[PDB]
Amino acid sequence: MIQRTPKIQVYSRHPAENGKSNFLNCYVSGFHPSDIEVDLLKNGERIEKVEHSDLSFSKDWSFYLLYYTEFTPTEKDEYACRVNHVTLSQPKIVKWDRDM
Amino acid sequence: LLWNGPMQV
Amino acid sequence: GSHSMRYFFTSVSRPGRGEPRFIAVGYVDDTQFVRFDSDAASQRMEPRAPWIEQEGPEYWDGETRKVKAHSQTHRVDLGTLRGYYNQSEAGSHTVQRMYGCDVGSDWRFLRGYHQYAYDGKDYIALKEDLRSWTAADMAAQTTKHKWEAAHVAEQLRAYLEGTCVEWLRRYLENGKETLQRTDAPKTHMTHHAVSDHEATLRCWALSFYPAEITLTWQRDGEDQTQDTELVETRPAGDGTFQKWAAVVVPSGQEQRYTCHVQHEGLPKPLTLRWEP
Numbered sequence: 190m191i192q193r194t195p196k197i198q199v200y201s202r203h204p205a206e207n208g209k210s211n212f213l214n215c216y217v218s219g220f221h222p223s224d225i226e227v228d229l230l231k232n233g234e235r236i237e238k239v240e241h242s243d244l245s246f247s248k249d250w251s252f253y254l255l256y257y258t259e260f261t262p263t264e265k266d267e268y269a270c271r272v273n274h275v276t277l278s279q280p281k282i283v284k285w286d287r288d289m
Numbered sequence: 290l291l292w293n294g295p296m297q298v
Numbered sequence: 299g300s301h302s303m304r305y306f307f308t309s310v311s312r313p314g315r316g317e318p319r320f321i322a323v324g325y326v327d328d329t330q331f332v333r334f335d336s337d338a339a340s341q342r343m344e345p346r347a348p349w350i351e352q353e354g355p356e357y358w359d360g361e362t363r364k365v366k367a368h369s370q371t372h373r374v375d376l377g378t379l380r381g382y383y384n385q386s387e388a389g390s391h392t393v394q395r396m397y398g399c400d401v402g403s404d405w406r407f408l409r410g411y412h413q414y415a416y417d418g419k420d421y422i423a424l425k426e427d428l429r430s431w432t433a434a435d436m437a438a439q440t441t442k443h444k445w446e447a448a449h450v451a452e453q454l455r456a457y458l459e460g461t462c463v464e465w466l467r468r469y470l471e472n473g474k475e476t477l478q479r480t481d482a483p484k485t486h487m488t489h490h491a492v493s494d495h496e497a498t499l500r501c502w503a504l505s506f507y508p509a510e511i512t513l514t515w516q517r518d519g520e521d522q523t524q525d526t527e528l529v530e531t532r533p534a535g536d537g538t539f540q541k542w543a544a545v546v547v548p549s550g551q552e553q554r555y556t557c558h559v560q561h562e563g564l565p566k567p568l569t570l571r572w573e574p
Contacts, residue, residue, distance in 0.1 A: 190389075190417050190418070191417060191418035191419060193418070196530065198529060198530070198532050200532065200540070202534050202535050202536060212535050214532070214533070214534075214535055216532045216533065218530060219530075221392075221418040222310070222390065222392050222417075222418070223308060223310055223319075223392060224310070224390070242330075242533075243321060243323045243330065243333045243335065243346075244308055244321045244323075245306050245323050245325075245330075246306060246308070246394055246396075250394055250415045250418045250419070251418070252308075255533050255535060257535050288488075289542075290361070290461055290462070290465035291305065291324075291361055291364035291365060291368065292305075292364070292397060292454065292457045292461075292462075293364050293367070293457075294450070294453045294454065294457065295367065295368055295371045295395075296371070296444070296445060296448055296450045297371055297374050297375060297378060297444075298375045298378050298379060298382075298414070298421070298422070298441040298444075
């Protein structure tokens with residue numbers, strides 16, 4: 190059995206602008222096997238209204254998925270991606286850095 | 290369009 | 299220029315939890331146009347791009363029948379492979395299949411492929427000539443002999459050289475408004491002081507299609523691939539892609555560094571330079 194730990198990127202569809210409708214993306218790639226838990230967090234609380242892409246894989250056979258939610262950035266709110274997978278001894282939280 | 294001919298390993 | 303149609307299939311066994319998960323997805327270049335998910339309510343091949351929605355109920359009934367025959371084949375295969383490797387019934391295993399065809403700028407057949415993986419590793423692949431197989435190990439030689447006896451390669455090759463390229467052409471014509479597009483990257487450079495002696499330059503590529511791109515930093519026309527921080531190309535979620543590349547430079551020396559962007563959508567490669 191090969192096990193590959195996920196790579197995680199957290200980013201917006203469009204350049205972030207306070208008060209303006211946008212999408213927050215958590216892109217999880219490079220992982221095996223396919224069973225993975227992904228949650229978008231607002232100030233540490235799980236967002237329910239999250240969509241995801243259909244499971245696909247790259248030429249090395251590792252899987253990738255996009256999770257995304259419609260949101261409005263405000264100056265106060267912190268967003269993060271929480272990921273769990275068999276390669277992770279506990280959930281990895283990755284913060285949304287606005288400029289990135 | 291899918292292939293109609295996949296065979297068991 | 300060149301185009302491709304690819305189908306991707308995953309099957310995951312569920313020990314003590316019944317039927318295996320099965321997910322099938324189809325792509326023209328980097329655009330998903332169909333899917334099937336065993337966990338979904340429809341139990342039908344579903345559309346995922348606007349231009350495939352115009353195919354009639356005969357198309358959908360036919361793709362549904364063929365995707366379910368794929369599901370049944372993968373169902374048997376997970377049992378057969380557990381047998382071949384004498385693995386316990388306690389563990390989950392994965393089969394992955396990918397096949398498809400490339401055409402050139404003349405929309406004529408360029409190449410076809412069929413790859414099959416068990417637990418994230420090559421099990422058996424069709425060779426470039428589409429006439430024979432490469433089997434990864436002694437278990438896969440059993441499969442190889444069964445597929446030779448049943449002349450799978452000949453009937454798979456008739457699909458990859460015939461049907462596959464004919465329906466790719468049909469989809470390229472029906473999807474012209476979106477499939478034939480090349481969106482050149484929108485590019486910009488940011489500059490962030492780290493200290494009085496060092497600074498980060500970051501080169502951005504946004505809103506590009508397809509996903510294939512090169513972003514490279516040069517110093518005095520010489521590659522900098524040892525000190526470049528690079529992220530993997532990522533989906534925006536609207537059908538375009540994003541990427542950035544960063545380099546830490548001495549303060550006062552920003553004008554020595556150039557960011558090189560190569561993309562199918564660009565007449566010629568871009569060079570970007572930081573100017574205050």
